[PDB]
Amino acid sequence: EPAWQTRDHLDDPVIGELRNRFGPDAFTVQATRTGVPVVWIKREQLLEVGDFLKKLPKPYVMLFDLHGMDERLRTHREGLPAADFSVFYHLISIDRNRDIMLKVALAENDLHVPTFTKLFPNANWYERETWDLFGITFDGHPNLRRIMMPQTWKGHPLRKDYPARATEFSPFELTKAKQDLEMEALTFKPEEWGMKRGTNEDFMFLNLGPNHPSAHGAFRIVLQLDGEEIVDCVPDIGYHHRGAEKMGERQSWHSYIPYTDRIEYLGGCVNEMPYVLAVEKLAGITVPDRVNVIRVMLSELFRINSHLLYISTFIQDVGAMTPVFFAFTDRQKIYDLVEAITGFRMHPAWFRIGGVAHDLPRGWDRLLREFLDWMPKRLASYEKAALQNTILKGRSQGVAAYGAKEALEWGTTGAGLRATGIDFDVRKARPYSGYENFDFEIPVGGGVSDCYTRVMLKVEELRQSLRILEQCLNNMPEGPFKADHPLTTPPPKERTLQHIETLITHFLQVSWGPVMPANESFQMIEATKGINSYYLTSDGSTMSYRTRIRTPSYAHLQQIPAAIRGSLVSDLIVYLGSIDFVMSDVDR
């Protein structure tokens, strides 16, 4: 049985436990290509099912995702409950290495679900984003305001009847918005943002944004302060919203790949991989081995690039401005190899449905060998220059520390989750893209996630990525760079240029789009900054019916208030430098 085969997952023990607890008629099991059991639960039993999953012998401890879907235009809904809208809850059990997708069906008039925040605190921002983009009200939410769009925004953009394209610009709207930007400091009310007891009169309100002098993006944090002590803080995000999901509903399966590049713009091919993997799951494509090793090579190269930039920016935020120049020279070496392979520096747009855009250029191994010889001495130099310095250690150790429980309840993944002592990497637990054929280690922490522990874990991850790159250079199969499937978009170019059936396939795939049959697919990968995921719903057309991108920087920014509570502003700056987030990843 192939990995893309449609499975109902009725042999999962979670289905049997749910049947024994709630009854055989309490839910509907859906057969998908997501790889996880999809269970449609009634709305009135949602909190009961969540509590039952939370109190399992090997419980589902992390709310991985929570969002909505507009099901009004979905023609192929066979074996599904009648739904105008739906809300899905993706929960991960690390102990079982399993996950379950609960789904709640809502009518068009009764668009309200009970809040999930009493079970999982990340449901705060997840439900705020669901309300902002779909208009679904969550009863019991502490403060259900818009998180992506401004508060004075009419309509909900991810609904099907909302126009995707840009409206006409008016200087009047900009000028009045400048007026509210002017009186926002004067007319600030903490009750709007969920804060309480604002201005006792021992607290002051501090706004860091909107523009920070850093490469992680532009955003605001409002802080309740007693002197230099932070008591309450909520981040103001949505300043980097690009409508990537709404764009996914109006681009074909092939023409959306450059938009998948700019989700985490320090990731590139790392961001391209889960999307093309989920599309290949929809298409029923098993890629050959050379495609797997090429994609692994480019993903590890871009992971090293992102980790180098993150370590450099953390060192610069500490105060040492020297190693960022040398590490950007190293990034220039990586960019030289990436320019040679894909033709571009930062957003290659090189992964394809079924393979990659071109074969590897003649001489890639030379550039890879020079880069692999160049890296370790520079890494040791950066280590001895800044990451073994006592001033950097005093600035970074013990700042914004959290344990395994806090990382599990807030959906923190990547360096922080492994620094809390939990060994969970997608490249080993749920392997993808032929990662089982590479010998590499997963670094883990002692059990407490400091800034320093996360930075050293990222350094060890860079070392392991260098090991993977060495294995890619030494052992590469000789064969096709595209699959032997009719849905490989585009087909190989020489056969397009001299065969007429291949020309027909190329013509209809680049113009109208490749036709993915109606199914739901899900791919979860380990990104450069945590765990990334693409959830793609196809209605049988040439475009995505629903593109849902889960990014870890959302969860990290939501964990920001729970970890910095009771600390200083400089601790907040060091924490922001030690998260490895981009605002495009948060806001997408």
State the Cα–Cα distance between residues 302 and 522, nearest whole angstrom.
22
User: Taking CB within 5 to 8 Å according to partner kind, which of other proteins, ligand SF4, none is near residue 178?
Assistant: other proteins
Which one, 133 or 531, has the nearer CB to other proteins?
133
Which one, 349 or 468, has the nearer CB to ligand SF4?
349
Neighbours of 555 (CB within 10 A): 29
Nearest approach, Cβ of residue 508 and ligand SF4 (Å): 9
- Binding status of residue 239 toward other proteins by CB under 8 A: yes
Cα distances from 462 to residues 78, 229, 375, 528, in angstroms, run: 46, 35, 10, 10
Which one, 164 or 504, has the nearer CB to ligand SF4?
504
Nearest approach, Cβ of residue 265 and other proteins (Å): 4
- Binding status of residue 329 toward other proteins by CB under 8 A: yes
Nearest approach, Cβ of residue 12 and other proteins (Å): 26
Of 79, 319, 447, 540, which one interacts with other proteins (CB under 8 A)? 540
Of 15, 47, 385, 508, which one interacts with other proteins (CB under 8 A)? 508
Nearest to 567 by CA among 396, 449, 400: 400
Q: Three-state SS for 197?
A: coil
State the Cα–Cα distance between residues 584 and 578, nearest whole angstrom.
17
User: Strand pairing of 229-236 and 351-352?
Assistant: unpaired
User: Can you give 216-274 as a three-state secondary structure string?
Assistant: CCCCEEEEEEECCEEEEEEEECCCCCCCHHHHHCCCECCCCHHHHHCCCCCCCHHHHHH
Instruction: Give the DSSP H or E segment for 105.
Output: strand 98-106
DSSP string, 25-36: TSEEEE-BBSSS
Of 39, 222, 247, 285, which one interacts with other proteins (CB under 8 A)? 247
Q: Say if CB 279 and CB 522 are below 8 A apart.
A: no
Neighbours of 349 (CB within 10 A): 19
Nearest approach, Cβ of residue 262 and ligand SF4 (Å): 5
Nearest approach, Cβ of residue 159 and other proteins (Å): 7
Q: Say if CB 33 and CB 520 are below 8 A apart.
A: yes
State the Cα–Cα distance between residues 10 and 17, nearest whole angstrom.
11
Which one, 341 or 564, has the nearer CB to other proteins?
341
Nearest approach, Cβ of residue 357 and other proteins (Å): 10
Nearest to 50 by CA among 88, 76, 77: 88
Nearest approach, Cβ of residue 244 and other proteins (Å): 8
- With b for 16 or more beta-carbon neighbours within 10 A and e for fewer, the 151-178 pattern comes to eeeeebbbeeeeeeeeeeeeeeeeeeee
Which one, 143 or 512, has the nearer CB to other proteins?
512
Binding to other proteins, residues 70-129 (CB under 8 A): 72-73, 75
Which one, 78 or 201, has the nearer CB to other proteins?
78
Edge-to-edge strands, sheet with 204-207: 204-207, 220-226, 229-236
Q: Say if CB 193 and CB 234 are below 8 A apart.
A: yes
State the Cα–Cα distance between residues 199 and 514, nearest whole angstrom.
58
- Binding status of residue 380 toward other proteins by CB under 8 A: no
Which one, 262 or 393, has the nearer CB to ligand SF4?
262
Nearest approach, Cβ of residue 65 and other proteins (Å): 22
Of 58, 77, 118, 366, which one interacts with other proteins (CB under 8 A)? 366
User: Taking CB within 5 to 8 Å according to partner kind, which of ligand SF4, other proteins, none is near residue 157?
Assistant: other proteins
Residues engaged in binding ligand SF4 (CB under 6 A)? 262, 265, 504
Answer positive or negative: Cα dihedral of 424, 429, 432, 437.
positive
User: Taking CB within 5 to 8 Å according to partner kind, which of other proteins, ligand SF4, none is near residue 552?
Assistant: none
Nearest approach, Cβ of residue 218 and ligand SF4 (Å): 12
Of 52, 188, 205, 265, which one interacts with other proteins (CB under 8 A)? 265
- CA torsion angle for 292, 293, 298, 300 (degrees, to 10)? 110
Nearest approach, Cβ of residue 337 and ligand SF4 (Å): 20
Binding to other proteins, residues 302-321 (CB under 8 A): 309
Q: Three-state SS for 569?
A: helix
Which one, 25 or 166, has the nearer CB to other proteins?
166
Q: Say if CB 524 and CB 91 are below 8 A apart.
A: no
Question: What stretches of 430-551 show up as alpha helix (H) in DSSP?
Answer: 451-474, 493-498, 500-511
Nearest approach, Cβ of residue 287 and other proteins (Å): 16
Which one, 16 or 155, has the nearer CB to other proteins?
155
Which one, 332 or 570, has the nearer CB to other proteins?
332
- Binding status of residue 499 toward other proteins by CB under 8 A: yes
Q: Which two tokens stand for residue 503?
A: 């020309």
Which one, 321 or 500, has the nearer CB to ligand SF4?
500
Tell the residue number behind the tokens 């990451």, with chain if given. Answer: 387
User: Taking CB within 5 to 8 Å according to partner kind, which of ligand SF4, other proteins, none is near residue 227?
Assistant: none
Neighbours of 194 (CB within 10 A): 14
Interface mask toward other proteins for 186-225; x: CB under 8 A = ------------------------xxxxxxxxx-------
- Binding status of residue 162 toward other proteins by CB under 8 A: yes
State the Cα–Cα distance between residues 502 and 225, nearest whole angstrom.
66
- Binding status of residue 394 toward other proteins by CB under 8 A: no
Q: Which two tokens stand for residue 127?
A: 């439900």
Of 271, 412, 519, 542, which one interacts with other proteins (CB under 8 A)? 542
Interface mask toward other proteins for 463-492; x: CB under 8 A = ---------------------x-x----x-
Q: Say if CB 104 and CB 54 are below 8 A apart.
A: no
Nearest approach, Cβ of residue 265 and ligand SF4 (Å): 6
Of 26, 31, 80, 149, which one interacts with other proteins (CB under 8 A)? 149
Helix axis angle, 269-283 to 289-318, nearest 10°: 150
- Binding status of residue 152 toward other proteins by CB under 8 A: no
User: Taking CB within 5 to 8 Å according to partner kind, which of other proteins, ligand SF4, none is near residue 367?
Assistant: other proteins
